[PDB]
Amino acid sequence: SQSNRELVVDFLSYKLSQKGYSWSQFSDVEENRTEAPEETESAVKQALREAGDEFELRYRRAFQLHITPGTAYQSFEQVVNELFRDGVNWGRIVAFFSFGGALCVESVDKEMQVLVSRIASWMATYLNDHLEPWIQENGGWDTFVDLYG
């Protein structure tokens, strides 16, 4: 079974690293970074990293939140709730990852880096509670790799 924690940690590690930050500075949860490239989990991680890059590029071409530690949970959950309210698809799942990554990077920039591990928690919880039934019914993360990898 695919760990959603592992995908969150990998994706947020990637987005932080693109801005010069290291995940390990903000959490003691480690990622499995030694698994073979041929493994399905490595393929999922790579597909999600690249899909996030492509999402962020397209978002920037087409398109205030004022995150604070006291409002971050509600702002995260309300955006994610509206994102998925009329349905789930893999592109909206990529958007969910990119949104979390953006919040994390911004949190470190604004001296609110305690939020990095908390955003990661909220993302994994949302995946495990609310996205996992759809993921399982739509061919799992292997199907994501077929479509995006």
């Binding site: 899909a51 492509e54 999402f55 397209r58 978002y59 087409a62 398109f63 205030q64 939140l65 702002s75 309300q78 955006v79 994610v80 709730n81 509206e82 994102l83 698809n89 893999w90 592109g91 909206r92 799942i93 990529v94 958007a95 969910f96 990119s98 949104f99 739509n138 199907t143 479509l147 995006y148």
Partner: peptide
Amino acid sequence: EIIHKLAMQLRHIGDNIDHRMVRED
């Protein structure tokens, strides 16, 4: 209004990169 606006922009781009799964019906 910013939460709705942001969610709909994320959703629009999400749908734009998506619609990749094959419908078998």
